[PDB]
Design an enzyme around this catalytic site. Sequence first.
Site, short mmCIF file in Angstrom:
data_model
loop_
_atom_site.label_atom_id
_atom_site.label_comp_id
_atom_site.label_asym_id
_atom_site.label_seq_id
_atom_site.Cartn_x
_atom_site.Cartn_y
_atom_site.Cartn_z
N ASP A 274 -51.99 27.01 -61.09
CA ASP A 274 -51.63 27.93 -62.06
C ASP A 274 -52.41 28.27 -63.43
OD1 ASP A 274 -48.69 25.82 -63.58
OD2 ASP A 274 -50.98 25.54 -63.47
N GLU A 275 -53.51 27.82 -63.46
CA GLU A 275 -54.14 27.98 -64.83
C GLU A 275 -55.39 28.94 -64.66
OE1 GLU A 275 -55.11 24.38 -67.32
OE2 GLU A 275 -53.47 23.13 -66.29
#
Length: 388
Positions: free
Chosen positions: A100-101
């Site tokens: 998620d980054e």
Amino acid sequence: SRVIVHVDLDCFYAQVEMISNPELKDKPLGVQQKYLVVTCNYEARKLGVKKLMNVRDAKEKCPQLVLVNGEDLTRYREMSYKVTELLEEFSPVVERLGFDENFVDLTEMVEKRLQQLQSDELSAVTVSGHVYNNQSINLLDVLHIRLLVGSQIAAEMREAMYNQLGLTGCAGVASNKLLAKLVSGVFKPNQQTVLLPESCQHLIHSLNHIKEIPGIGYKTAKCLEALGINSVRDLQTFSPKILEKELGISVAQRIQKLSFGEDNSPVILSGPPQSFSEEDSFKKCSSEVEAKNKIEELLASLLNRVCQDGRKPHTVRLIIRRYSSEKHYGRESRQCPIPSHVIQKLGTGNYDVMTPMVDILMKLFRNMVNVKMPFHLTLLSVCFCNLK
DNA sequence: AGGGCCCCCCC
DNA sequence: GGGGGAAGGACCC
Ligand SMILES: Cc1cn([C@H]2C[C@H](O)[C@@H](COP(=O)(O)OP(=O)(O)OP(=O)(O)O)O2)c(=O)[nH]c1=O
Ligand SMILES: [Mg+2]
């Protein structure tokens, strides 16, 4: 000067689970992975739950905690790539870090916008979101202008991520990856922050331990401590020489530049995945010396779901750890080739690879320090690297 | 808990 | 003087 943006989504797994079952976006939710709540929505992060283990913990302090199992990562990985692709549409150079980054190099895009802008509406440029340390903007400062434009692109990405994918998250805009990553977490619930140059030191000194600095994990943290280094200023002022003669001229110079908020590393285009790993449990908590399963399970869908992207692997690797101390001391893998032709077929006979994978794994394992604590002590991890 | 750059051969 | 392949590290989400 670069304008980098760091996109970090809110409690990712919880978000993907809440979007699946709406009747969860109102109560404290945690995603469980073998007696370990990896994450939980903010509507529970307030209840002391801090991604802590012990399923019973939050349970009591929240009867309707309605925990969901997040062992199968398929859905998360799919949304993860949809986020990266959406971001890639804004600008090609995008780096993934976990599921998620995403780091995005906006330099060229920011310039293209500035040039396109008039020599009058340039003084009308405004910021989108928070300005770190409530620092005053100077419209005549070229770097301020470019970073503010960066904040505008960040707001567009977050808006598009929500409108097109239904996901919320934070963004951080700064001059390098370290600072962008650090500033994206200043206002965490679904918000964004931009860091103007004059506040770099304030941001770096806001950290409470050199270990909180991106690029300094559990290892270096310990090594610096034993050297009389605990605070960021301690590292900034430590004698370079001694540091160099302890971690090397490579790590020393890099580690120390980070203490000043200096990081020249480029944003790397991640592109397609270079490997398809897929660990498993029943070997970290309790196992029965399984085998025929530790190959059909670990390599279950890992097979029938590798033709989708239409790419062929050429190497297998089994990682294994043990009951240690300190932290997670345990790194012991084992890689090998993967015959082509019949093995790397393209028809119905795919089951034939089942057996071959068995013997290798069941050979690279019996060669895994089988003498002192090599059995039953948390392990199990297979990989599929080398694809073309 | 699940996922993803950096000694040995044999030439 | 010069490549390729293992087994593991090391570091991060
Ligand atoms: C760190 C870390 C993350 N993850 C997973 C859980 C998260 O959903 C996802 C993203 O990592 P994180 O960003 O650190 O987790 P988060 O998005 O849930 O927390 P926040 O909202 O405060 O940013 O990857 C792990 O499985 N194991 C880990 O050790
Ligand atoms: Mg996150």
